[PDB]
Amino acid sequence: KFEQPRHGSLGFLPRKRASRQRGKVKAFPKDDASKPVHLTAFLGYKAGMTHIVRDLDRPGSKMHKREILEAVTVIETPPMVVVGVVGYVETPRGLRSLTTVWAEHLSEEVKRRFYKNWFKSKKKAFTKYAKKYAESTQSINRELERIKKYCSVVRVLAHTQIRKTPLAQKKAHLMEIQVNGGSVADKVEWAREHFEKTVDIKSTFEQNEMIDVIGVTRGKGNEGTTARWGTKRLPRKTHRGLRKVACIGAWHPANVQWTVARAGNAGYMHRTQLNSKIYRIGAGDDAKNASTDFDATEKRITPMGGFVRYGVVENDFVMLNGATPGPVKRVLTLRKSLLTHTSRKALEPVSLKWIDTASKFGHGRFQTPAEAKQFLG
Amino acid sequence: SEFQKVVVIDAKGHLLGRLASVVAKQLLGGQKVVVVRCEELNISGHFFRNKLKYLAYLRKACRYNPSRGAFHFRAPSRIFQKAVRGMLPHKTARGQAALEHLQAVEGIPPPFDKQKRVVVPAALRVLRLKPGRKYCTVGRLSSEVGWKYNDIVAKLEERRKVKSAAFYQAKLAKQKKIASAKEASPVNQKLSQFGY
RNA sequence: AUGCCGCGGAGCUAUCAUCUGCCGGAUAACGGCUGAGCCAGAAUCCGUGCCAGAAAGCGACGAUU
RNA sequence: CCAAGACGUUGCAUUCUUCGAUGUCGGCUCUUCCUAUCAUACCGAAUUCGGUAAGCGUUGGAUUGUUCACCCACUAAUAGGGAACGUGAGCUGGGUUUAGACCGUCGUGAGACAGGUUAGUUUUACCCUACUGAUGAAGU
RNA sequence: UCUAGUGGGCCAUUUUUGGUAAGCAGAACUGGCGAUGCGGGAUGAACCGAACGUGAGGUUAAGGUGCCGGAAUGUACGCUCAUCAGACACCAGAAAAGGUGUUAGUUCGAACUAGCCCUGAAAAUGGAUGGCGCUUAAGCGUACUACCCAUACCUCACCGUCUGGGUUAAGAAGCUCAGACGAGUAGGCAGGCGUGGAGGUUUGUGACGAAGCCUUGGGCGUGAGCCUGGGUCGAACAGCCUCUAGUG
RNA sequence: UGCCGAAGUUUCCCUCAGGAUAGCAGAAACUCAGAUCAGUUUUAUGAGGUAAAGCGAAUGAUUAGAGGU
RNA sequence: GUACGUGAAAUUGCUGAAAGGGAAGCAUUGGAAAUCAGUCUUAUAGGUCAGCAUCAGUUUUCGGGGGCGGAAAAAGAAUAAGGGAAGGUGGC
């Protein structure tokens, strides 16, 4: 008599908790040898989010050359340290990690990644590797030559200087970033010469690029079918409960189908949201990073009172259009977009007019303390 | 009839059912069998008919938890193993243990590219199908139903063929030297009346 | 049995608020080419993309009382 | 199919199971399948009709307990059907609904009515499985 | 002569009645199922073969021999290409008419007539020649050998029944020779096994351990059952002939 | 454990979920005997009105002309 | 040891043994492990399992020699005649 589309997508189940806390880049952009050697991923921490005012320069739109207000997400992205390289060889069964070469000196931040109990451990990780690196570099040279000769994919191991961010966590987050561009020999030379050095997000992303943001969403715990799946609430007269699915199947098949809404975990899941513009890559040292050109008023990105549950962002940051998966202080992965896009929305340059730094811990009314003292007697 | 410790079979130009039936009987005989180059296996009937058959196979799935439903393997080695598995009593411990004596692979991996590869005349396309009958290759059928390592195997097989060709030239030169020194020996005629 | 009323940060939440959601290949109908084969062509099928990761599929690596 | 689309022609009740009991209509909810296609895509024939095609969608209300129905609208369109005439340890109980009671007809009467009309207790999962999430011993 | 059970039937062949039809109702002959396993039909009460004591060997029926599966990836000559071919009776279902399908035939290039294939052909959880697969078949038609195996047949051993022939030199209620045969529900009959009590019997067993109980021990019988070793236990109990019954 | 082994049909019944009755069946016997027999064939000889056949034969239904009126 | 003669089965704990990929149990045949008895040991004769030989009964599978039969096979060969045409050889 009536029809209604399915409640929810079947492409995202199982709706189970993610097996990882940090987002896994499941696909890297297609390698182009014409392009120069570059990184195709980065790893930051969601500081918070705010809103901005921007003049819309899209011809043919109803609000062309008139101000709009957009919500933006600020991710603190202190430079990543390249600590190693790993080679992948294509096989009839898929990619296989041929070998891994580590840097001579690894910081304590990345060494803590290898220990569940760093306090009680003797901190002996990579000690013999450092010894062999110093005494005999020929074995390392053979390893790098093997990567150049056989491996067709090169990924740099990078860790994040988490001690620069205001986080109680001290284990640095470590990941593999695929190095596209140039020959495999060029990738290895780029990787080896960048051992123990830092790569800044300004080099990777270019203030307007459409990127994908990867992360594990905020966990809502166990939920019912009304909230987990969006089914209709049953009438007030219902006996034994109404926040559930009334019929869970027909007589035949004599089983509950995988396509029926049920209760359980609704949240803490791995998502890869596409097409997020970088509105601004701000430098940590610059004290004018949040100040635009039409605003002056030298100010920083951090609102008054600090980012709620995050603190003050002092390092390089990225301001993205709209929302991103996950809570604050969650590790997020920003990767280059795999698809090509020639849309006017995706290609229009972005020039901000004003960035809101009023306190988000309430109803802020002042942008900076300097004018707060002006208004207050 | 002869018993080998392991039999490596070049599956190029062989028919899927004819080879699977021969292999399945050999496995039940207690013989370990390795089948290489499964992407070159042939099937009678034009491709479109074979493609439709496999699409019919993809349609089979459990109405609850397709993860319980039939697992449709796309790799040509896995297609051949499925044909053999349907010819072995696999639900039984006898026919199940006879499965792990079979190793079907795509291309010829390093442990087997240096070993003699026999063929089965009872399963060869040239000796079984009348000329002019359309046929398809499992490798091309797999590449359209989901298999995604077709060109990697082709590249690795081309490199292996070059290396094997260079070895054959070396073996030809050594055998030519042996044959040249063979006739100089006077025993060659002393063995003549014996048929050697 | 939170006495009641105004405002109420934080959290939760609203298609009551905001952001985000694409191109490859083979084709059916059908139209061609030469005289089967190949080309063209659908929201179709199959893959890139996306989610799960075999708890009895696997690799590289670190340290080894 | 046949030629003057007429005329023809060929196709797509029973009582076997259950009476030491298989919960009996509709709606609500939710899922899935079929194509005999309403809309959308692609061509083809003179706003009108077909071919491939089930990918996605297929509404808000008035009355009636109703499945059909019929209306006022909107809409790209408001296609049809299966799932134990899908779906009561899922709901509601309007229809059906024993005992109360009223009316009409029938009966000498007790009563009858496949006529109308009001009122009328809707139990149980902690087991197995399945499904939905959550741990987890052990090869290496 | 006396008596039991039965006095719901069902299926198949052929003939047939009422019926739009039916895994429908009602009959006639024969064979089956009920009461009946076994080999084959993937599977199934009555379909095909064959009817059954315990075994050894050989050979067959129906059906089969690519693999699952024991047995020729046999021989000879052909037909078939199917975008969801075909694959063995009962049987798991399909038609008229068609085809620039193809192989043949018949008659005056044409009309035809015949096989195979295709169209006609059109549903609902994923899915069934039994499965895998099969295309000079592992499909279809025909011929021809070889081979596979039923509890069927054949020779043999043993068990029982029945039948016949011997036995005054052998619990004569004994001994001995020979042949045929062996399904079974309701039902019949015979001979045995086991339980409680009674008469007789056994120079019967037993506190140096009766009965009872437990037992990865041993022996006997077709079986009901019996015997025994080891352990536990503490006062009674059994074999044979007969009697009896609140006897499994 | 061994031997044998059915019936759902006839007739009557306030009978139709049951009985009596005949049949099938089991035990126990008794006689008879190269007899007295057979779910068979053959030879000899009867009987029947089904299949077919027929409508220029009766009866019944029906097509078409031609002749004699 | 009064929660008292004997002290069964259901059910239960511990120990030992083995098995276990969505039931278990059961039948046939043997392996493996465990366990055990008969038998012999003795009085020319006798214990357990084997191998060959010569026989008997049953059956299976290869081979040889011979007789008879048919159009007293049909053919064919060698050797004499006649006739014939080709899908025509040499010669044109």
Nearest CA among B134, B174, B24 for reference residue B89: B24
Residue A253: is the preceding peptide bond cis (ω within 30°)?
Answer: yes
Instruction: Answer yes or no: are the C-beta atoms of A317 and A74 closer than 8 Å.
Output: yes
Within 8 A by CB and 6+ apart from B45, the residues are B134, B135, B136
Within 8 A by CB and 6+ apart from B27, the residues are B33, B84, B88, B98, B99, B101, B102
Give the rounded distance of the alpha carbon of B166 from its chain centre: 23
Q: At which residue do the structure tokens 């070159």 appear?
A: B40
CA distances from B104 to A295, A305, B19, B75, B109 (A): 70, 66, 12, 10, 11
Query: Rounded to whole angstroms, how far apart are CA atoms B116 and B20?
Result: 20
Query: Rounded to whole angstroms, how far apart are CA atoms A75 and A328?
Result: 9
Query: Rounded to whole angstroms, how far apart are CA atoms A57 and A67?
Result: 9
Strand C: which of residues 27-46 in chain B lie with Cβ below 7 A? 46
- CB contact under 8 Å between A256 and B64, yes or no, is yes
Q: At what angle do helices B47-59 and B138-145 cross, to 10 degrees?
A: 50
Query: Rounded to whole angstroms, how far apart are CA atoms B18 and B25?
Result: 11
HEC secondary structure over B92-112: CHHHHHCCCCEEECCCCCHHH
Nucleotides of E under 7 A from a protein CB: 66-69, 73, 81-85, 125-127, 131-138
Phi then psi for residue A346, to 5 deg, are -85, -15
Strand C contacted by A96 CB (< 7 A): yes
Beta bridge partners of B102: B33
Pairing of strands A153-160, A80-91: antiparallel
Beta bridge partners of A281: A318
Nearest to B65 among A90, A92, A258 (CB): A258
Instruction: Answer yes or no: are the C-beta atoms of A367 and A299 closer than 8 Å.
Output: yes
Instruction: Spell out the alpha helix ranges (H) of chain A.
Output: 108-111, 127-135, 138-149, 184-193, 201-204, 225-228, 344-347, 369-375
Chain B residue with the nearest C-alpha to that of A260: B64
| Backbone φ/ψ region at A310: left (φ over 0), alpha (ψ -120 to 50), beta | alpha
Query: Rounded to whole angstroms, how far apart are CA atoms B103 and B85?
Result: 12
Strand C: which of residues 346-365 in chain A lie with Cβ below 7 A? 360-363
Nucleotides of G under 7 A from a protein CB: 21-22
Please give the full DSSP string across chain B, using - where no structure is assigned: ----SEEEEE-TTBBHHHHHHHHHHHHHTT-EEEEE-GGG-EEES-HHHHHHHHHHHHH---SS-TTTS-----SHHHHHHHHHHTTTTTTSHHHHHTTTTEEE-SS--HHHHTS--B--GGGBHHHHS-TT--EEEHHHHHHHHT---HHHHHHHHHHHHHHHHHHHHHHHHHHHHHHHHHHHSTHHHHTTTTT-
Query: Rounded to whole angstroms, how far apart are CA atoms A122 and A114?
Result: 12
Q: For residue B65, which residues of chain A lie inside 8 Å, CB to CB?
A: 258
Query: Rounded to whole angstroms, how far apart are CA atoms B134 and B121?
Result: 20
CA distances from A274 to A77, A179, A329 (A): 19, 21, 21
Strand extents, DSSP E, chain A = 38-39, 41-55, 67-76, 80-91, 94-102, 153-160, 174-180, 198-199, 210-216, 222-223, 264-265, 270-282, 317-321, 331-336, 352-355
Taking the CA of residue A312 and the C1' sugar atom of nucleotide E160, their distance in angstroms comes to 106
Resolution, given in Å to one decimal, reads 3.1
Interface of B with A in 90-149 (CB under 8 A): 106-107, 149
CA atoms within 13 Å, Cβ hemisphere of B68: 7
Q: Does B153 touch chain A (CB under 8 A)?
A: yes
Taking the CA of residue B83 and the C1' sugar atom of nucleotide E4, their distance in angstroms comes to 65
Taking the CA of residue B99 and the C1' sugar atom of nucleotide E89, their distance in angstroms comes to 39
Query: Rounded to whole angstroms, how far apart are CA atoms A338 and A275?
Result: 10
Q: For residue B67, which residues of chain A lie inside 8 Å, CB to CB?
A: 258
Q: At which residue do the structure tokens 């003699």 appear?
A: B116
Query: Rounded to whole angstroms, how far apart are CA atoms A262 and B59?
Result: 26
Q: At which residue do the structure tokens 């010819």 appear?
A: B87
Q: For residue A93, which residues of chain B lie inside 8 Å, CB to CB?
A: 149
Taking the CA of residue A233 and the C1' sugar atom of nucleotide D94, their distance in angstroms comes to 22
Beta bridge partners of A52: A70, A355
Q: At what angle do helices A184-193 and A138-149 cross, to 10 degrees?
A: 150
Query: Rounded to whole angstroms, how far apart are CA atoms A177 and A214?
Result: 14
**Method by which this entry was solved:** cryo-EM
Report the largest interatomic distance among the alpha carbons of chain B, rounded to a whole angstrom.
80
Nearest CA among B178, B173, B188, B10 for reference residue B104: B10
Query: Rounded to whole angstroms, how far apart are CA atoms A64 and A57?
Result: 5
Is residue A125 packed enough to be buried (19+ CB in 10 Å), middle (13-18) or exposed (0-12)? middle
Closest CA–CA distance from residue A12 to any residue of chain B (Å): 14
Q: Which helix (H) or strand (E) holds A246?
A: none
Instruction: Answer yes or no: are the C-beta atoms of B10 and B37 closer than 8 Å.
Output: yes
Chain A residue with the nearest C-alpha to that of B109: A92
Nucleotides of C under 7 A from a protein CB: 9-13, 18-23, 25-26, 28, 36-37, 45-53, 59-64
